[PDB]
Design a protein around this ligand. Structure first.
Ligand code: ATP
Ligand code: ATP
Ligand code: ATP
Ligand code: ATP
Ligand code: ATP
Ligand code: ATP
Ligand code: ATP
Ligand code: ATP
Lengths: 217, 217, 217, 217, 217, 217, 217, 217
């Protein structure tokens, strides 16, 4: 299908490998720690003990063949950077590397990483957003001003109808989905009821959504 | 406003503190490492050097007053656990803790953590999704089966109309937004045109969205 | 008689199980590693392969029946903690747990471990005592100031009598036993002789015993 | 004073180093793990990062000068053995090594270890002894058969006199000390009273002490 | 005076250090190989064994103080690159690095090396020039086209005057110096004689000098 | 024309071969490594895979015919020596050999090498010279005391005339050339201007040139 | 036939493997250096890259099956000792080990090596014998006093008969063999002729043989 | 008597010097390592610290006077070669040099070494011989097919007579010597008895000797 190499079976890397394996892709799980290789042996096509900073080992893995290589090493800047460099000189098409800090990001950038990810930082931003606003369970920003938001329904919304809560005119936002007891309602009709503690999916302008949050719920 | 305590100024914790501070909330940035405290001094209300496992220091911080306390310590399972536990005995309303792996999650759960987060794991899943499918720029999962996806438009979608691409009937999914050259169109009418390289926001079942990606683009 | 459960057949745990079995007590030896179960099969009443963190397995062991359960898992803090906790919720009378370090000691303490042991640490202290003082073979502290000490006799003590070495008056300490060529003399009379390289058992104040070591031997 | 080298800052080794440093001896704490060196920097004279497996590094430490070298590495048999061998060829006077199992003990023995210690095993035996007999707080074995035991007094012993409990004739054992509310009585006269929950220090044959425990308390 | 750090005491680095030391400059000779440190101990102010890729060792050297740091490591691209990066982050004013190949040059360039040198390559070019033309003793290129050349005089030039050999008009080149039996004539007048086997210093265009070599000598 | 044999296509040897080929000479590129024969195939007349220590292969090359043979093997002292020796016994007119160190230089010297070169060492000296003195770009020593130096112009020299900087009288040195933006001025007249960052070519006594560097620029 | 394992393909080991292979025995050539494995690939049944100190690799070799295992590692005392120990614990029938010095010999002895060889030392003794006495080509000592010696015939022995050189009576020694131009004469009759430069095999007392060497040749 | 110079006191060289000294020859032991000079001071006439590659030191030794000079340096090819070369230019009659591998043998050969020895290799062949055939104690090859072998007698040979074991007719081989309890019997008569565990010296064809070994013992 498509070949993926996950170097560094951490939380992040391990998750990548496990999920990708669940999707049914050819995933090579590489780690210097034997116990990590042993741990993700069930969740990969081939799990190998290797020092990714050692070139001959990298050739012994046959990494040149892979379309995507992911360096999920993030506290050892040295190892990460070095590995990325090795892969670059070996003409790997796509090199995705975790990064630790702004300068590690810089060095990855300069040695030609294709995509640099900061999982902890981004998730930090998200969870902080959820912290300052208890109503938001999840969300996605369409742009600087427009967003789709998932909200936890309060008592103020219990037994209320979509036509009762006229968001499309009063607030310029549109409701997309209602999740009740695990059951799911997509693009619901105005007659539908929202019960408390249910998942509500609204879409619109950020400020408008906050307006609805304040006065509605 | 609302008082937040961020213990552990890593990428994740640091991001939480910085972002929350950008929102203009009272954020207490706590760290045992002096240089971290010095680093996030600009991005907090009060930045303090403290050993969060030492109770008398925790009383010296006056942590009982805070509505939300975030334990962003994730490689030192031990310290994290003790700290969370300390906060629990001190009757803190909301304790959100960063976890490393499943059993650390278990012990946090059992000592009564209010919310446990796995940033690296979740972001790993997301990036893996983006890896197996180059077309997805971003997304949000409404549930195990239903999701809203942001897609990068290919040439197959160039100059195509919403009524031309009948997703609501043929694939059971609904288009929510179109982003063209930075300009943004929310809940667009069937006459609207989609140009390649534009942002397309579809909503529906995961498998159905994959179907549309397959035959459509 | 009395029922004991030893979870974790390490050196320490294995020693507990083997020794208890030699005394003729009902000892259930539990381990996740099959080879450990096979190893201590001869030295237990019932040796079972079980994941002690998995509750249903813990019920399958019928651990609720046991008066004493010993968690001898010490490098995997997580397994130890989770297991100890499981036992606590199952209302086990006495839970003795092996600890690795101070904060793990803390979390064990707070989740209600009944007795926490640091074998390596304590034995370290003892062997260090023996290191700085080649004369001391072993000892037991009665209190902060008073102790019973086992000493290796030097040439200065060869062919010396108990009445000759008046410890009861000159140093306020009392000799308890003399071990000569494996032969043993308990509470010896003043006429008895001490030959070099023999075991001498003195009792008294620490500083006083040091005094006697200094001027006497 | 006297120079000590502690190689391997584990629980056991770390305890040795910390305790020895508390005694005010010159202790060189050596470890391959940087974080361990950093941890015990406060509890040593000189804390060095070194792989004790490399000879030139061992010369860089100047280990030939030390009277006592302690190999506190116990799960890595290879490293332990090798270090011990290196030290032996370097004509170190006293080499004390922590062992894991019987065969590692054998190889240490054959390559000329001066003293081999099994902390976990021995402490296991002790704790097992305390487990089968809740009454014993501590003890020291004078030989295979004779021992001095510290006992927790029960209700059966409350308000009883030493002459009342004639251990010297009825059981052939002798009482050495009584600890009451922290206060301490050494080699007490027959008129003295024992109150419950006090520390009792008996001396004699193992079987005899068990007998006294049985009928007496 | 000025402080120099030479990391990597190979031939190139060693020559740098030795020569600089001969000039009487403060030169810190750093090497991971003990024998190299021992070799250049006589030819430096301070010769230290250090792993230049290890940051804490680099701080232990106190390298931040130095005006010039030279990475003379050229077959280990890894070590060179890594070290250079470390020095850059430590805000070293001038970092001169020895390179192996074009891509190592590239990565050095991108991580901000101040001067990159290819000794073997350049000297290769020079020696090749001397190989195809047996007559040239030495030379210096002013530019791609213009150069000053030192020539060994043949019989065709014996007893010839500067005015006889009109290089300034016939070939557009100018003679700068004549070395006869060790005696030296700088900017000689047209009456001066050139005897064979003497050193002749001409200056001009490369082609013109070759022309003069061809028809003249 | 003239025939050259380059044995060992390293950086140095490869540079020799490539440069010689650019001049249009008959160059035989010999290497035991197939990939280097393949690499320099474009930059030679004939590129052959051969073991230069094997005599029959050397006869198969027909090396006796060549006027110049260059042994550019420098880390394998053995191969270098044996090869050079082979060539000597085969009565080769000119044998130029790359040397690694002083003693290899000795053995090459004694087995009758015609010219021995140390590229790394010499270039080391040069680059070191440039290191202690940022102002000098290049130079050539006419004798122990007299030299021609190429200098990088500073701000102190900007917009200054040759007659303004009277070097011929004030410092006894003479300016030979000025290189401005790649353009070149040979033996310039006193009216000419020197702009900063330009190449300046002075000629005279070493100490005098320094003097001029000191007070002038 | 019989199975041999040669670990360490040095001069000594490599020679063992090559010679053994020439005899047509099943020889497993094991080496950690890939190039050594590649070198002796032609001179073995199976040539494998393996770290003989790593147990799992040793099981991957299936070394338990072999009757004879030879540790030909001699400058790395560590590897030799460790490997030998591994083989011993794996119940290998015959373990022959190359030793470096007296103490390495000691540790090999104590860990139960079956045969310890010192090639350099022994050959040193032999070559020394040939050095002090130029006359001897080869020899074997039957005892402290009696020996069989191979001698290079001089001119004094040319065209001489066995009956002419009466060694059996005049010197008490006996001639055993004469080798002339590769042709061989075993236990030759008294009529036989010895020509110079031939191999002569005499047998007797050392001093007597020396006597014959002195007066005879 | 005869003057010998042993340069390089390793095992091989040291053995040479020691053995030569035991025979009572004038042996000059030369070494650059002071401790080796100190070590073999007792086993030489004159033991000197000298760098054998340095000519003036070689004249300071007065090596021109010696009939035999032995270069026993074998891992430092460079030093060995240069030294041998120095001795050659100094017109030394006999230069015997220890070689490492085939090419070092080549360079020694070509710079005119008189005798080149490979101790490890040859001894390798021998020990290999003994490895494939456990029966042989020692031997000497007269030619490719004919040999004299020393054998360890088994039980099959106990109390057997020479006439009983008719080797001269049945196997075409001849017995030369019998060594019993240190006592020695040369060219024994047919009545003589062979007891087990005695040394037996047979002579003949290799295959024939193996035949006798097979059916006979
Ligand atoms: N040079 C190397 N070659 C191969 N694998 C390596 C190398 N260095 C580190 N690794 C592996 O990469 C993994 C990266 O996880 P690490 O322990 O570095 O923390 P982390 O990745 O930041 O944590 P997480 O991924 O859980 O957030 C480790 O399991 C380690 O075994
Ligand atoms: N007991 C403690 N008390 C206070 N601060 C701590 C404690 N333990 C860790 N920290 C701080 O919390 C921060 C957490 O980041 P850390 O380096 O532990 O990796 P992480 O948090 O798993 O990864 P990330 O930095 O991406 O979140 C660290 O910078 C550390 O200084
Ligand atoms: N979750 C678990 N369930 C059951 N058994 C476990 C679990 N985790 C570890 N064990 C067992 O407990 C034993 C504990 O010994 P381990 O090797 O973990 O080191 P240790 O106990 O600190 O060292 P030692 O006991 O040798 O001093 C191990 O043999 C292991 O097989
Ligand atoms: N080759 C080596 N060289 C130097 N130090 C080492 C080497 N191998 C291990 N160590 C160090 O020695 C220490 C030994 O402790 P380790 O973690 O191996 O468990 P342990 O000693 O059995 O446990 P404990 O000492 O807590 O009972 C470790 O901290 C490790 O960093
Ligand atoms: N990580 C490191 N840290 C510090 N020093 C290092 C490191 N790696 C290599 N070196 C040193 O740098 C020097 C580089 O020389 P090396 O042996 O790599 O060959 P080289 O430099 O190509 O040889 P030459 O310079 O003579 O051409 C070595 O002497 C080595 O000891
Ligand atoms: N015996 C030999 N016969 C033929 N070619 C050889 C032999 N030995 C080495 N070579 C080749 O000669 C080339 C010389 O470069 P090498 O890698 O030996 O280092 P070097 O030449 O000292 O370094 P540089 O590349 O800077 O010149 C190598 O590419 C090697 O393949
Ligand atoms: N840990 C190991 N595991 C397997 N093989 C090893 C190990 N260590 C060394 N060897 C191999 O054993 C061989 C021993 O030869 P080495 O280079 O050590 O010199 P040596 O044996 O003294 O020289 P010689 O055998 O020529 O007398 C080497 O070829 C090496 O590759
Ligand atoms: N240039 C030199 N001048 C004098 N002595 C030297 C010189 N080079 C080496 N030696 C000495 O010669 C001795 C030879 O032993 P070396 O360490 O060279 O290994 P080796 O001789 O091959 O091994 P072994 O002799 O143990 O089989 C060394 O002890 C060394 O000190």
């Amino acid at each position: 299908n498509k070949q993926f190499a996950v170097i560094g079976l951490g939380r992040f890397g391990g998750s990548i490998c496990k999920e990708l394996h669940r999707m049914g892709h050819e995933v090579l799980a590489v780690d210097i720690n034997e116990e990590k290789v042993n741990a993700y042996a069930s969740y990969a096509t081939h799990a190998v003990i290797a020092n990714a900073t050692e070139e001959n080992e990298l050739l012994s893995l046959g990494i040149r063949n892979f379309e995507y290589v992911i360096v999920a090493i993030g506290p050892n800047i040295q190892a990460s950077t070095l590995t990325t460099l090795l892969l670059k000189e070996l003409d790997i098409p796509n090199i995705w590397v975790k990064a630790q800090n702004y300068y590690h990001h810089k060095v990855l950038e300069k040695i030609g990483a294709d995509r640099i990810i900061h999982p902890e930082k981004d998730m930090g931003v998200k969870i902080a957003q959820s912290l300052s606003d208890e109503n938001v369970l999840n969300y996605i920003d369409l742009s600087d001003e427009y967003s789709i938001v998932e909200l936890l329904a309060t008592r103020k919304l219990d037994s209320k109808s979509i036509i009762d809560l006229n968001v499309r005119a009063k607030y310029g936002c549109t409701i997309l989905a209602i999740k009740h007891h695990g059951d799911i309602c997509l693009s619901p009709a105005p007659e539908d009821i929202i019960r408390e503690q249910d998942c509500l999916v609204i879409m619109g302008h950020k400020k408008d959504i906050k307006r609805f949050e304040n006065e509605g719920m």
